[PDB]
Amino acid sequence: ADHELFLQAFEKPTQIYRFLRTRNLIAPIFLHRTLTYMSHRNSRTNIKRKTFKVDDMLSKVEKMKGEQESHSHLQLTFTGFFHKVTLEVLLVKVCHKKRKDVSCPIRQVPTGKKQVPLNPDLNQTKPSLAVSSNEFEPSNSHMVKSYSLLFRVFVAQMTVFDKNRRLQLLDGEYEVAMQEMQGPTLQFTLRWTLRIFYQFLYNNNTRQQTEARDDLHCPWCTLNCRKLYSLLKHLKLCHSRFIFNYVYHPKGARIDVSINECYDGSYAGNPQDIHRQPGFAFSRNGPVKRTPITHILVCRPKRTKASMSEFLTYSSGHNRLYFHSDTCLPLRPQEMEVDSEDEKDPEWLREKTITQIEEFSDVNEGEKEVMKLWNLHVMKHGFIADNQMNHACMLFVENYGQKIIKKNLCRNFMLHLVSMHDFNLISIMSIDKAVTKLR
Amino acid sequence: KEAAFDDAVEERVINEEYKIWKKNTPFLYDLVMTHALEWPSLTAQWLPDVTRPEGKDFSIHRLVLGTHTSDEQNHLVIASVQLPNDDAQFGGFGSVSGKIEIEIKINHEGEVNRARYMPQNPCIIATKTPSSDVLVFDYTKHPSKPDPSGECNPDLRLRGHQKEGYGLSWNPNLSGHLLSASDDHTICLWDISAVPKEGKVVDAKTIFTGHTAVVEDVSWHLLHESLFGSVADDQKLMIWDTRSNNTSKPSHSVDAHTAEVNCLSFNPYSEFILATGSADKTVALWDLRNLKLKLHSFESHKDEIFQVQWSPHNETILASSGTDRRLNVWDLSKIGEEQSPEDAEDGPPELLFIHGGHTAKISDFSWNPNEPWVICSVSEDNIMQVWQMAENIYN
Amino acid sequence: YSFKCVNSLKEDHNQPLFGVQFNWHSKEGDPLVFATVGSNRVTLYECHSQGEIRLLQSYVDADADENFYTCAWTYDSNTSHPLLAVAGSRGIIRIINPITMQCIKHYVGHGNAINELKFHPRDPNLLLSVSKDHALRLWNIQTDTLVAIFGGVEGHRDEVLSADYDLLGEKIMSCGMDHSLKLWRINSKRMMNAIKESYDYNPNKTNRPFISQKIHFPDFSTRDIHRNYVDCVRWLGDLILSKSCENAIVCWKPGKMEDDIDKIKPSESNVTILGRFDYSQCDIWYMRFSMDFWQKMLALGNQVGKLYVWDLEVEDPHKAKCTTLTHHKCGAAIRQTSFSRDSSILIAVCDDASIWRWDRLR
Ligand SMILES: [Mg+2]
Known part of the structure; x- marks a missing residue:
């Protein structure tokens, strides 16, 4: 028993839900508090009227309160740099990304530069002041996202505001470091101027058992179910690629899990894409036509109540991929039209019969040619009723007039007419009539 | 490259997620109706008329659908649907043969970019085309069997x-x-209330130009016959009260969202409540009295927003669609309601519901009359879904 | 005329291999590259001097269980990248681009395992696929369309095994379990009209499915040669070569020595045998022989690990040649032989997922 089997098997379903866990945690598929059996969630009710013509006044007053205050230039000197050359300071302006824009727009405008000493030190001074106007404007409250401050000689950066248009920069002497492309640093000032258990079955060849820690939280999606009922539900529905069973060990709960057997998970889209030569499948970049279908799933619910004892959809249209009768290839939704790839005359048959005729030795070409030219037309229309035979020979020469003439074979045609009358299907009243219509 | 690999992965993931949502639906809705069309659509409109045959368990409704085929003949279509109109009835719920059927086909030149029926005459509808004009039609004047030739009576284009x-x-x-x-x-305005000499040529009575960007949407007032706003990618909403005679300077104009505005809608039951929708993945709203106040913001869509629609039969119910393959349902009453940390991790309170059916960019949706709480949705995957949420959510 | 074991390798999965194929599309001077397919893996090596061989690449299929069977080297007219296609028991045909290390094309239209793949010597988009479905198909690997289906009222009745293009590429032979060997033609007008059509079809253009060609008749056949299975045939100029489990290789021509190859009437009912070749212990089937691009020497694997070599020269097949190069390590079996474009090296696969190498000393 190479237990890697038990491993490899149960390996697969895990990572999937694992990824799905995070995804859903940020990518909700549906608000859980709406769920029926998760009714303990959504503690609030739906009891309120809340007329609207008053919603404004509550905000009309609230905005008087919400308007706290605002800030009303700047000037700051750079204490000499320190390290164990002119400086470069910029004003970068960030705006909101737009429709055609793939990333946020940033505008790095320089307010100016100065000449800092070459990594100076203390007690040597006896000085470049940076003064800023109101470069930022209140109109920018619709276009720019944020403003930051850049510093190079060698890189450094700071930002000016908060998302609430809240300045983050008071006035004072500050000591900061910087990086290139402890150690180098610069100073400056600023101024504004029941225990639960599991058991993992492997078709009884082996198994493994564990115990739930921090129970009533999903061992995969960490969903907080507050009842064995709701937990059992969420498990036997969401993490469906397995199967479960309720054992009720005396210690409070035990669930011996097993893998699903079928779990019919296969692509549910245009059933044709599955076979598009790769690179084109899942194109998702051009409308495509397909056959119409209609399903029904939720018609009228029961709305029963909880019952732990319990714990222990039709079609209309074509729902598959049809194939060509003779090559086993897919069938486009248009090719499945009136074309029915079937009729009375199979090519290979026409060939086979002529060939078989040619086996005969005791015949003249003035006979074989005739027999073939006739039997083929026989096949072509499928004559059965004896009352047809008159019209038959008629149409026969009606088609093969030019040929038998070009064959100069009409005389044996007449011999055939003789034979056929002999077999009681022609009247003399037409035999001649043939040679008549012939010319 | 990378994007290809990544997209293959994303596709497989979406497939899994839809599998799950389907497995989970029964405890979630009061109706599930799915149907596949041959060619997708870009339109949605419930006809305001309803018939309910007796001795049965179901109503009957008519829907207004467009068509954007690949290359072949375009068509305007309106089909039939048998909604269960019953509480005790449930082959499936009614007859066994069919619940949906096409009934109206009309030849069309170019795809359909928009289609709405006239409120005064439902037999009158409009049509936006790939061209630079407008088409109007009255189905009662054309056979359902389409002209095998092709293009036909434009019925007074503009x-x-x-x-x-x-x-x-x-x-x-x-x-x-x-x-x-x-x-x-x-913004071009025709008045076909009286065009005896049709000639298939009517020029717009008045042409307004106040936006300097490609306009996105426009909607009349709901009570006033002389009031309507404007939407372009300027992110500027402009109020256009007519009878003031200025196609250049409107009555009002402000900035609505930081991204381009897409969709716009007014509350029916109120007088002042506007519902706005933009590319900002945001949802704002305004009032006719004062405008210099973004009243609120719904912030859960994860891509652009292309449609907003208030609820008939409900004063405080709205709907937000976009590209994220999702669909939201909000609530104006639960604005900032203290909820449990698990209720909060579920989501903010005022957000009411989220639809989980489609698996592509949700093209269009619609409320309907004649039925309290149901909406049909159309994606770009030839997919039409109709549903009814479970009842317990409200009350 | 002397090869020596200058290297021998072995896999790890130990499951027998079957395929060996030098890339006979080497721009003169480029290194020697060759590949080999096993249970469910492919292998990329390069011949180096001093009996050195260097692992290059390897892929594997996990999603099912298959025992790959054959391979073939080709290129792309568009950008000249090397191209390799393989197929196994599942009956699917895959197409891999080593330059990107990906499969770009897959084909599924058979009903059983596949047994061999070859290409038209001239056209590089024509793939012949022989199966157990009694049907020999033929694809346009470029426009993604089938062309012909040889088999039917007069086809093979049991599990076609092996086929071989003529030297110029207009005539084919086929052999299968039913002791039967049949001739097909390609030069027919109808056929080449079909091919040209195949090179022209847009699915978006028409609402019609492309129309293949069904052929229900060999040009000529017989079963009088062997009284056992036949599992490998080789065109010889205008002569024929074939082997059975009867421990002898035979050369013959249809009809009489006077009978031209291109005048043969379909109802021909005579064949002319010329000579026989001999060896020992080939008492099982599915074992192949190969030949140099210069058609001057003969290689053949063996059941007990031996070899047997002849010359395709004036050496009279009565007493043409006898050359057995042998080593003492594996005598499990040897499936298949393969030469370079020149006659420098010769590889063969043992039944135990072990490789061999023999460097010639002329
Ligand atoms: Mg693919």
């Missing part, structure tokens, strides 16, 4: 635009009054 567009709105009070909005940065 004139006055130079690039295509998507805006479309009759005036509810005034017949014939209809607004348009196209890439021309202009």
Whole structure:
């Protein structure tokens, strides 16, 4: 028993839900508090009227309160740099990304530069002041996202505001470091101027058992179910690629899990894409036509109540991929039209019969040619009723007039007419009539 | 490259997620109706009329659908649906043969970019086309069996635009009054309330130009016959009260969102409540009295937003659709309601519901009359879904 | 005329291999590259001097269980990248681009395992696929369309095994379990009209499915040669070569020595045998022989690990040649032989997922 089997098997379903866990945690598929059996969630009710013509006044007053205050230039000197050359300071302006824009727009405008000493030190001074106007404007409250401050000689950066248009920069002497492309640093000032258990079955060849820690939280999606009922539900529905069973060990709960057997998970889209030569499948970049279908799933619910004892959809249209009768290839939704790839005359048959005729030795070409030219037309229309035979020979020469003439074979045609009358299907009243219509 | 690998992965993931949502549906809705069309659509409109045959358990409704095929003949379509109108009935629920059927086909030149029926006459509808004009039709004047030849009676097309567009709105009070909005940065207005000499040529009565960006949407007032706003990618909403005679300077104009505005809608039951929708993945709203106040923001969509629609039969219920393959349902009453940490990790309170059916960019949706709480949705995957949420959620 | 074991390798999965194929599309001077397919893996090596061989690349299929069977080297007219296609028991045909290390094309239209793949010597988009479905198909690997289906009222009745293009590429032979060997033609007008059509079809253009060609008749056949299975045939100029489990290789021509190859009437009912070749212990089937691009020497694997070599020269097949190069390590079996474009090296696969190498000393 190479237990890697038990491993490899149960390996697969895990990572999937694992990824799905995070995804859903940020990518909700549906608000859980709406769920029926998760009714303990959504503690609030739906009891309120809340007329609207008053919603404004509550905000009309609230905005008087919400308007706290605002800030009303700047000037700051750079204490000499320190390290164990002119400086470069910029004003970068960030705006909101737009429709055609793939990333946020940033505008790095320089307010100016100065000449800092070459990594100076203390007690040597006896000085470049940076003064800023109101470069930022209140109109920018619709276009720019944020403003930051850049510093190079060698890189450094700071930002000016908060998302609430809240300045983050008071006035004072500050000591900061910087990086290139402890150690180098610069100073400056600023101024504004029941225990639960599991058991993992492997078709009884082996198994493994564990115990739930921090129970009533999903061992995969960490969903907080507050009842064995709701937990059992969420498990036997969401993490469906397995199967479960309720054992009720005396210690409070035990669930011996097993893998699903079928779990019919296969692509549910245009059933044709599955076979598009790769690179084109899942194109998702051009409308495509397909056959119409209609399903029904939720018609009228029961709305029963909880019952732990319990714990222990039709079609209309074509729902598959049809194939060509003779090559086993897919069938486009248009090719499945009136074309029915079937009729009375199979090519290979026409060939086979002529060939078989040619086996005969005791015949003249003035006979074989005739027999073939006739039997083929026989096949072509499928004559059965004896009352047809008159019209038959008629149409026969009606088609093969030019040929038998070009064959100069009409005389044996007449011999055939003789034979056929002999077999009681022609009247003399037409035999001649043939040679008549012939010319 | 990378994007290809990544997209393959994303596709497989979406497939899994839809599998799960399907497995989970029964405890979630009061109706599930799915149907596949041969060619997708870009339109949605419930006909305001309903018939309910007796001795049965179901109603009957008619829907207004468009068509954007690949290359072949285009068509305007309206089909039939048998909604269960019953509480005790449940082959499936009613007859065994069919619940949906096409009934109306009309030849069409170019795809359909927009289609709405006239409020005064449902037999009158409009049509936005890949061209730079407008088409109007009355189905009762054409057979359902389509002209095998092709193009047919345009039924009084219009004139006055130079690039295509998507805006479309009759005036509810005034017949014939209809607004348009196209890439021309202009709003063109015809009045077909009386055109005896049709000639298939009517020019727009008035042409407004106040946006300097490609306009996106326009909607009349709901009570006033002389009031309507404007939407372009300027992120500027402009208020256009007519009878003031200035196609250049509107009555009002402000910035709505930081991204381009897409969809716009007014509350029916109120007088002042506006519902706005933009590319900002945001949802704002305003009032006719004062405007310098973004009243609120719904912030859960994860991509652009293309449609907003208030609820009939419900004063405080709205709907937000976009591209994220999701669909939201909000609540104006639960604005900032203290909820449990698990209720909060579920989501903010005022957000009411989220639809989980489609698996592509949700093209369009619609409420309906004649039925309290149901909405049909159309994606780009030839997919039409109709549903009814479970009842317990409200009350 | 002397090869020496200058290297021998072995896999790890130990499951027998079957395929060996030098890339006979080497721009003169480029290194020697060759590949080999096993249970469910492919292998990329390069011949180096001093009996050195260097692992290059390897892929594997996990999603099912298959025992790959054959391979073939080709290129792309568009950008000249090397191209390799393989197929196994599942009956699917895959197409891999080593330059990107990916499969770009897959084909599924058979009903059983596949047994061999070859290409038209001239056209590089024509793939012949022989199966157990009694049907020999033929694809346009470029426009993604089938062309012909040889088999039917007069086809093979049991599990076609092996086929071989003529030297110029207009005539084919086929052999299968039913002791039967049949001739097909390609030069027919109808056929080449079909091919040209195949090179022209847009699915978006028409609402019609492309129309293949069904052929229900060999040009000529017989079963009088062997009284056992036949599992490998080789065109010889205008002569024929074939082997059975009867421990002898035979050369013959249809009809009489006077009978031209291109005048043969379909109802021909005579064949002319010329000579026989001999060896020992080939008492099982599915074992192949190969030949140099210069058609001057003969290689053949063996059941007990031996070898047997002849010359395709004036050496009279009565007493043409006898050359057995042998080593003492594996005598499990040897499936298949393969030469370079020149006659420098010769590889063969043992039944135990072990490789061999023999460097010639002329
Ligand atoms: Mg693919």
